[PDB]
């Protein structure tokens, strides 16, 4: 028992992290086979940052401008190209620690593990969800550009996030590993801001199921509700609509707990209308929305990864 | 910016995790140099569990009774011995992935990373604090015995915890890597229970400093208090006494924020007496006590590990 915000074991990703230096700028890169992936902003300088001009900036670069350091070993850059907002540096050495991997873009409401990195050296690992407004509530300091987010499925690392910057509310924006931003953000300094967020309804229901599995039942009740009548209450509290697919995805959890999805919606309805009256759920005084149904099943049933 | 419950990168520990099987019991072991460490309960059977008798149980064992599997490679056991509640299996192969390490026992109130493992295969990583009552609020399912907790300091893994079992409130008890329990627990089934806990006062103050560093200032006030007058309020709310050493340890955080430790105590006093009035601190509606001063400095300043 117990329920924790739990990341994937980071070892397979630690073995891919390198340091990329261009001019006076140093950030993290991701070394897979013979390519290093990193944010293209590494080729910018402290006055190029205002409205840069990246095709122009890159044509003025040569391979020898890029210093790639894998631990205490220098990698020779033999080619460079840009894909959207990422730089791809071909190096003369394939990473012998390359795990099996995919580049996968995630959906808002989905979670992933972040390996925070500085100067190519992993610092910590934690779990994040992609918010409905395509930001993540990360923990990043200066030098963390190029840190990656990922999920692991058996032996295969699905990279989904590369860190690019911090928005003025302290939330974070980045790209998938094709260099495409999540959300309406750019790798510049503009006045860009997150914009309105919502709570991930299906995740909150998954977490209530996790609580029931773990022995917190005080919030249950005899009531039920219609999907329509629940969604009307969700909308005043700034919760996302719940779909039949969400109901279907919650099926397995509903099955082991014996608590119909619509019954749990009734409970959430009451929690939203009454608050928690001084009590806690899984050690939280807030309705928690950054665990998916999959995360709950994984931790309340116990699969591993090789 | 941002503040997350962040674990150490788990790669150096993933490379030490093995599977130990004795009879019909299978759990996790920790392979360092040519020794595998694991809970001695692996030599128990489903009726030996009531009041076992471990010196007797072990003398009846031979090396070939122990099957050690490092991934898909079988390790040959050449010696076995018991140290308190851990078994030490000498194997004929030194782990080529042995990091530099120490066995260090931690204090209540200190934090560490846990690599949850099943059948020798790492499943996830999360951060825990050792509670004042010597339990940890972990996330463990059947098969997680022998999962380890650890801290990493530059390149050196300080192992501090081996998981042994779950108490009836769903909290967890285990040993240091010398086989000595944290707290008044035994590797048996008795009616043993956690017993009274308290909140880790110095950690809550560290977390309030983290919040100030991250822009949450609504809980600050002009007031100060005496260490004595604060400790009187701490005791009605079941908070640990605050010592001058705690004040000293909070010095650096007090210095970058410009908020005297005793001023922050006044703020905590008000938060304890008034609640949070619907607001949150670092995304929490509760006073959080499982980050140390060191954890806050590490994440709000950004050191890495090699």
Swiss-Prot record, chains A, B:
Inhibited by pyridone-containing alpha-ketoamides compounds 13a and 13b. In turn, alpha-ketoamide 13b (tert-butyl (1-((S)-1-(((S)-4-(benzylamino)-3,4-dioxo-1-((S)-2-oxopyrrolidin-3-yl)butan-2-yl)amino)-3-cyclopropyl-1-oxopropan-2-yl)-2-oxo-1,2-dihydropyridin-3-yl)carbamate) inhibits SARS-CoV-2 replication in human lung cells. Inhibited ex vivo by michael acceptor inhibitor N3. Inhibited ex vivo by compound 11a and 11b. Changing residue 49 to A: Does not affect ability to cleave and inactivate human TRMT1. Residues 1-306 are cytoplasmic. It catalyses: TSAVLQ-|-SGFRK-NH2 and SGVTFQ-|-GKFKK the two peptides corresponding to the two self-cleavage sites of the SARS 3C-like proteinase are the two most reactive peptide substrates. The enzyme exhibits a strong preference for substrates containing Gln at P1 position and Leu at P2 position. The gene is rep. Changing residue 90 to R: In strain: Beta/B.1.351. The chain holds residues 3264 to 3569 of 7096 of the full protein. Residues 1-306 form the Peptidase C30 domain. It is found in: Host cytoplasm; Host Golgi apparatus; Host nucleus. There is a cross-link at residues 5, 90 (Glycyl lysine isopeptide (Lys-Gly) (interchain with G-Cter in ubiquitin)). This is 3C-like proteinase nsp5. The active site is at residues 41, 145. 3CL-PRO exists as monomer and homodimer. Only the homodimer shows catalytic activity. Interacts with host FBXO22; this interaction promotes the proteasomal degradation of nsp5.
């Amino acid at each position: 028992s117990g329920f924790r915000k739990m990341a994937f074991p980071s070892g397979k990703v630690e073995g891919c992290m390198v340091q990329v230096t261009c001019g006076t700028t140093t950030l993290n890169g991701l070394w897979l086979d013979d390519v290093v992936y990193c944010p293209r902003h590494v080729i910018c300088t402290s006055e190029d940052m205002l409205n840069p001009n990246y095709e122009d900036l890159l044509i003025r670069k040569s391979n020898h401008n890029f210093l790639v350091q894998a631990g205490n070993v220098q990698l020779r850059v033999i080619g460079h190209s840009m894909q959207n907002c990422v730089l791809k540096l071909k190096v003369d050495t394939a990473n012998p620690k390359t795990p099996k991997y995919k580049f996968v873009r995630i959906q808002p409401g989905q979670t992933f593990s972040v390996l925070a990195c500085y100067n190519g050296s992993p610092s910590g690992v934690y779990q994040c969800a992609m918010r409905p407004n395509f930001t993540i509530k990360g923990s990043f300091l200066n030098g963390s550009c190029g840190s990656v987010g990922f999920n692991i499925d058996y032996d295969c690392v699905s990279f989904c996030y590369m860190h690019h910057m911090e928005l003025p509310t302290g939330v974070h924006a980045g790209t998938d590993l094709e260099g495409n931003f999540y959300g309406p953000f750019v790798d510049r300094q503009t006045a860009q801001a997150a914009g309105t967020d919502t709570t991930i309804t299906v995740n909150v229901l998954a977490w209530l199921y996790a609580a029931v599995i773990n022995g917190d039942r005080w919030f249950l009740n005899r009531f039920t509700t219609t999907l329509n009548d629940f969604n009307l209450v969700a909308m005043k509290y700034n919760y996302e609509p719940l779909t039949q697919d969400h109901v279907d995805i919650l099926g397995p959890l509903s099955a082991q707990t014996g608590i119909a999805v619509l019954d749990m919606c009734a409970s959430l309805k009451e929690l939203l209308q009454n608050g928690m009256n001084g009590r806690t759920i899984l050690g939280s005084a807030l309705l928690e929305d950054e665990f998916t149904p999959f995360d709950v099943v994984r931790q309340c049933s116990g699969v591993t990864f090789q």
